[PDB]
Amino acid sequence: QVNWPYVNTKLKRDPAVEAQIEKLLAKMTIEQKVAQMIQPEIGYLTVEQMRKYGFGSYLNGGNTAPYGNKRADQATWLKYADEMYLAAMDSTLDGIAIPTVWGTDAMHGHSNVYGATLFPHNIGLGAARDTDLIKRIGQATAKEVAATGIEWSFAPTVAVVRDDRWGRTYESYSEDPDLVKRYAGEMVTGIQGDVGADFLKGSNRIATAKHFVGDGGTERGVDRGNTLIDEKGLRDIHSAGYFSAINQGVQSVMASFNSWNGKRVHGDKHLLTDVLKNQLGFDGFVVSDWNAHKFVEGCDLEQCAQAINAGVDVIMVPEHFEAFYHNTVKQVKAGVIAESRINDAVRRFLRAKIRWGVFTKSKPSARPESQHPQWLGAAEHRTLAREAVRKSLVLLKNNESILPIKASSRILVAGKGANAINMQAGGWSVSWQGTDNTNSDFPNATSIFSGLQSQVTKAGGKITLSESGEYTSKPDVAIVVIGEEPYAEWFGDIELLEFQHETKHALALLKQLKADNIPVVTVFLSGRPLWVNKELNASDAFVAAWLPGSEGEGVADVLLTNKQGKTQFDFTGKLSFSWPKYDDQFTLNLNDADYDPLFAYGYGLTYQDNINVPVLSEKTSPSDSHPLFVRSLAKNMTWQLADTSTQKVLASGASATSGDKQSLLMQSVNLSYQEDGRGFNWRAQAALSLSYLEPTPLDSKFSTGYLELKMRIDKAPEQGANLQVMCSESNCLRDIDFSSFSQLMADKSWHTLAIPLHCDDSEQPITDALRITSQNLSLAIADVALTIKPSDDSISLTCAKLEH
Ligand SMILES: [Ca+2]
Ligand code: NA
Numbered sequence: 001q002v003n004w005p006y007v008n009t010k011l012k013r014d015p016a017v018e019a020q021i022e023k024l025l026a027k028m029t030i031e032q033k034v035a036q037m038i039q040p041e042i043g044y045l046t047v048e049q050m051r052k053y054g055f056g057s058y059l060n061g062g063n064t065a066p067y068g069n070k071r072a073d074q075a076t077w078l079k080y081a082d083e084m085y086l087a088a089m090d091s092t093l094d095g096i097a098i099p100t101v102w103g104t105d106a107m108h109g110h111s112n113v114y115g116a117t118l119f120p121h122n123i124g125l126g127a128a129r130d131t132d133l134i135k136r137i138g139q140a141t142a143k144e145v146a147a148t149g150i151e152w153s154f155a156p157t158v159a160v161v162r163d164d165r166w167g168r169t170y171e172s173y174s175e176d177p178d179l180v181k182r183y184a185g186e187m188v189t190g191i192q193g194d195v196g197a198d199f200l201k202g203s204n205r206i207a208t209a210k211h212f213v214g215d216g217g218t219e220r221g222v223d224r225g226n227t228l229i230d231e232k233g234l235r236d237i238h239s240a241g242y243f244s245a246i247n248q249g250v251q252s253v254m255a256s257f258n259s260w261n262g263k264r265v266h267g268d269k270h271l272l273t274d275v276l277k278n279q280l281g282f283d284g285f286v287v288s289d290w291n292a293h294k295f296v297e298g299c300d301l302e303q304c305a306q307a308i309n310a311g312v313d314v315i316m317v318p319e320h321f322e323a324f325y326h327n328t329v330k331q332v333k334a335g336v337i338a339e340s341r342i343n344d345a346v347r348r349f350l351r352a353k354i355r356w357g358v359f360t361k362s363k364p365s366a367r368p369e370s371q372h373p374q375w376l377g378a379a380e381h382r383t384l385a386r387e388a389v390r391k392s393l394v395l396l397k398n399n400e401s402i403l404p405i406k407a408s409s410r411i412l413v414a415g416k417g418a419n420a421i422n423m424q425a426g427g428w429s430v431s432w433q434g435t436d437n438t439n440s441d442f443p444n445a446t447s448i449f450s451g452l453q454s455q456v457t458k459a460g461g462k463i464t465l466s467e468s469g470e471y472t473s474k475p476d477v478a479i480v481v482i483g484e485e486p487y488a489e490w491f492g493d494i495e496l497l498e499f500q501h502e503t504k505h506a507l508a509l510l511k512q513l514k515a516d517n518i519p520v521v522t523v524f525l526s527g528r529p530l531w532v533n534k535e536l537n538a539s540d541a542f543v544a545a546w547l548p549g550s551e552g553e554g555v556a557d558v559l560l561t562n563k564q565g566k567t568q569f570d571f572t573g574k575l576s577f578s579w580p581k582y583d584d585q586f587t588l589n590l591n592d593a594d595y596d597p598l599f600a601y602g603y604g605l606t607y608q609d610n611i612n613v614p615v616l617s618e619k620t621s622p623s624d625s626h627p628l629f630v631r632s633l634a635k636n637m638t639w640q641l642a643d644t645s646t647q648k649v650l651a652s653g654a655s656a657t658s659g660d661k662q663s664l665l666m667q668s669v670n671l672s673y674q675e676d677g678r679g680f681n682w683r684a685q686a687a688l689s690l691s692y693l694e695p696t697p698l699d700s701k702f703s704t705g706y707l708e709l710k711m712r713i714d715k716a717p718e719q720g721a722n723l724q725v726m727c728s729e730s731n732c733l734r735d736i737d738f739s740s741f742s743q744l745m746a747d748k749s750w751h752t753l754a755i756p757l758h759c760d761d762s763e764q765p766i767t768d769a770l771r772i773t774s775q776n777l778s779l780a781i782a783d784v785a786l787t788i789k790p791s792d793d794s795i796s797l798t799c800a801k802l803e804h
Pocket of ligand 2: 053054087088089090091094095096097098
């Protein structure tokens with residue numbers, strides 16, 4: 001029994017707020033309470049629906065601006081907010097006047113919004129090591145969010161990332177929990193105000209700290225993957241940001257997409273209630289992530305009692321909110337969700353809305369914090385962001401002290417990222433992936449080239465832009481801006497650490513310039529360290545710039561001298577992530593037993609250093625199968641879920657249950673890709689089968705072959721379990737007890753099993769290709785296929801072949 005510390009020691013309840021909550025609850029219907037718990041998204045919600053139901057909140061999802069615009073004036077935002085506000089205050093139809101609130105993700109500023117200041121993504125902020133800077137970024141963020149009429153912003157993100165292959169690595173301040181703990185509370189107080197007289201007042205927003213918990217610890221860094229760690233490790237590594245965020249009175253916590261030791265966090269009452277609420281003492285409300293409830297066992301897009309019962313208070317159900325609402329109401333009335341649970345949810349959420357002041361403030365457009373449209377993209381905020389850019393940069397290499405570069409020089413700027421704001425901003429920047437962004441999507445932003453050109457012009461130097469490294473007058477030095485393309489979430493999941501392993505385009509450019517005897521300073525844009533020994537060798541200087549955001553001139557500020565030729569700003573950033581020396585150092589973290597990084601956590605050169613980096617090793621580390629379930633069901637194949645009391649259920653989708661909706665539950669899990677696996681839970685006697693739709697004789701091609709599959713056993717079957725292979729109602733080719741290979745599976749992770757079909761004591765057409773039977777078991781299956789010979793990494797569940 002892991003002891004988690006009680007950290008809710010500063011924020012005290014407000015007796016008046018609690019009185020209002022209770023007076024409201026005593027009179028509310030089940031329908032109204034549930035209504036408080038449901039959150040639609042603006043791409044799917046109408047004003048009419050808000051009027052009818054009075055949802056407790058609604059989401060600015062980012063895919064569209066209000067009214068369908070890509071761009072909208074602040075006034076337009078405020079009109080939309082007013083419309084929803086008035087629809088919620090209308091007690092016609094729904095019978096009550098509880099003000100709704102608008103929520104939005106604030107990944108690096110109010111980053112869904114055209115024209116908003118874009119701060120550097122978290123990895124660079126972590127490199128900055130500046131808590132006051134973080135707090136100020138929070139205050140600026142609060143103002144820019146308020147300027148669009150939004151009361152509730154999701155920040156900070158407190159993931160602690162342990163495997164850089166994750167596509168969300170840049171959203172984390174550090175691989176190390178300590179930095180995240182220092183930062184989280186600063187961001188929270190920056191947004192919400194300090195605990196005390198100004199708590200949640202004025203321009204301060206309601207904040208949500210994301211995500212609880214362990215999403216930066218999934219196996220191989222697979223997005224929404226499986227976090228395999230004991231509870232003490234979850235506490236000591238992945239939860240540090242929540243200690244300070246909860247301590248500072250964060251009003252909301254968002255649950256995480258990943259699973260913990262095979263079980264989805266969104267359905268885990270131990271984590272979301274006992275740990276988060278009871279032990280840590282969190283007094284605010286839990287919001288789910290985007291349709292996360294659909295991944296919970298027994299749940300789907302339109303229903304999820306388990307998540308609610310586990311401790312989720314507000315359900316982010318952007319599209320299917322209406323059906324979800326009615327189902328949840330029927331579930332509360334049926335007793336499968338106790339009213340005390342919805343009461344508690346409503347208390348926790350109303351505690352936030354009421355203390356923020358939804359009853360005391362006017363409609364959005366008339367509020368004091370709504371009278372400053374200039375807050376959105378404010379010059380002052382861009383100055384702050386520029387400071388953040390300067391402090392985020394980490395100087396990895398500076399041979400013969402080539403940096404800083406004389407501003408009066410003739411400089412060539414090259415590389416695909418030289419004048420591409422979309423690359424410097426990364427994902428979650430106006431659009432989701434950022435791929436389709438061009439410079440015109442970032443008004444008032446400054447590309448890196450533009451900043452350099454501005455300062456070089458002021459200093460009387462010469463500058464040329466050519467992505468491909470073309471020049472007329474041979475330059476004194478070339479600044480080459482290269483890096484990853486923008487990405488978000490699983491789109492950014494990678495398997496290889498080597499930069500551009502498929503093309504090595506940037507390397508070619510660098511070597512070309514080096515071959516012309518031109519000194520090379522590389523500005524590297526990325527959401528994470530990557531293996532770049534080759535590019536490092538082709539560079540005289542090399543700067544990790546991360547994803548700096550809108551203020552690209554922050555780069556010039558550090559790389560160039562002023563007009564007089566003197567240093568204007570030195571490097572200050574230090575690695576918050578370890579930099580890999582080899583292309584397979586996937587889990588390189590400070591305090592690791594074997595810690596052999598190229599550049600350690602905390603490394604960063606300055607102009608005061610006279611260090612050369614030597615040439616580094618550029619050496620890298622080193623058929624006819626018939627698919628049944630590889631990534632998806634093959635033709636003529638279906639799942640079957642059979643319990644004791646009802647007809648067998650044929651399922652072909654991402655999830656399902658047996659007839660009794662309780663005994664056997666199927667969900668989707670993530671081995672490598674999204675939803676390439678299926679997880680299963682036996683709570684009572686039941687049989688799962690991977691079955692042919694029409695009984696099919698075994699293909700002679702595989703008569704002396706193998707059924708091969710990948711299996712993870714989260715919890716070993718207490719009452720035993722049975723694995724049958726190639727069955728025909730009358731009998732099966734193989735019948736294997738789980739107890740007989742349990743020691744292979746005791747790491748609770750995936751294994752590739754090969755199961756020979758031709759054994760001693762070996763007819764009929766096959767109806768169940770695979771069949772698993774148990775009263776109590778938890779596992780996941782993936783990549784089920786017929787093979788002629790066992791794959792290399794496979795383990796054989798063998799048999800006597802004496803007869804052959
Ligand atoms: Ca690391
Ligand atoms: Na209402």
